[PDB]
């Protein structure tokens, strides 16, 4: 699912100069750049069954903050209820 | 008279099997309203109420709660009365 993520982030920001994984980039990676975080999978219930939590950490390059909300409404409107394919898992 | 809530649990693997053998089972005990308490027979639970909470726990809880009920007899074995006799006056 981290490929899926990463890919829809990618194609559907701009601004966006990457997305890596945890603990990928190094200090000259060019900011502003977005990671996604894997969390547990926990059981809730027959309706819901197994739920996973996910985290995209963006940064940015401490110009000020509100570019990291204007990105952080861009990641919001990109990934919120919208169905996203995985093509290496392709599921 | 004997009230016992026995609740049931079907574990499985397919979610759709558990609620394929709930189904089986809610449908064959209502039919058969009764149970064979042993192969003897001379005795027998009649159902009373068979539920089913589908939201249930699959491994604490239990999904299908089934009430029975049975009625036996004092099983009161006392002497008999073999010998009679009886005397007059007047």
Same mark, same amino acid.
């Given at each position: 699912?981290?490929?899926?993520?990463?890919?829809?982030?990618?194609?559907?920001?701009?601004?966006?100069?990457?997305?890596?994984?945890?603990?990928?980039?190094? &200090?000259?990676? &060019?900011?502003?750049?977005? !990671?996604?975080? %894997?969390? %547990?999978?926990?059981?809730?219930?027959?309706?819901?069954?197994?739920?996973?939590?996910?985290?995209?950490?963006?940064?940015?390059?401490?110009?000020?903050?509100? &570019?990291?909300? &204007?990105?952080?409404? %861009?990641? !919001?409107?990109?990934?919120?209820?919208?169905?996203?394919?995985?093509?290496?898992?392709?599921? | 008279?004997?009230?016992?809530? $026995?609740?049931?649990?079907?574990?499985?693997?397919?979610?759709?099997?558990?609620?394929?053998?709930? =189904? #089986?089972? =809610?449908?064959?005990?209502?039919?058969?309203?009764?149970?064979?308490?042993?192969?003897?027979?001379?005795? /027998?639970?009649?159902?009373?109420?068979?539920?089913?909470?589908? =939201?249930?726990? $699959?491994? #604490?809880?239990?999904?299908?709660?089934?009430?029975?009920?049975?009625?036996?007899?004092?099983?009161?074995?006392?002497? #008999?009365?073999?010998?009679? /006799?009886?005397?007059?006056?007047?």
């Amino acid at each position: 699912m981290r490929a899926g993520i990463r890919k829809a982030l990618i194609d559907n920001i701009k601004e966006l100069k990457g997305c890596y994984e945890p603990n990928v980039p190094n &200090k000259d990676t &060019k900011k502003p750049y977005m !990671v996604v975080v %894997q969390g %547990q999978d926990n059981d809730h219930g027959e309706t819901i069954g197994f739920e996973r939590s996910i985290e995209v950490w963006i940064y940015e390059g401490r110009t000020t903050f509100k &570019k990291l909300d &204007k990105l952080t409404k %861009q990641v !919001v409107e990109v990934l919120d209820m919208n169905t996203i394919v995985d093509e290496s898992e392709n599921e | 008279e004997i009230t016992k809530t $026995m609740k049931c649990h079907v574990v499985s693997k397919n979610k759709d099997e558990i609620v394929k053998l709930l =189904e #089986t089972l =809610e449908t064959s005990l209502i039919i058969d309203k009764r149970v064979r308490l042993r192969e003897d027979k001379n005795m /027998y639970l009649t159902l009373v109420s068979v539920v089913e909470d589908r =939201e249930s726990d $699959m491994f #604490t809880t239990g999904q299908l709660t089934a009430v029975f009920k049975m009625i036996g007899k004092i099983k009161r074995e006392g002497p #008999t009365m073999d010998k009679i /006799y009886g005397n007059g006056n007047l």
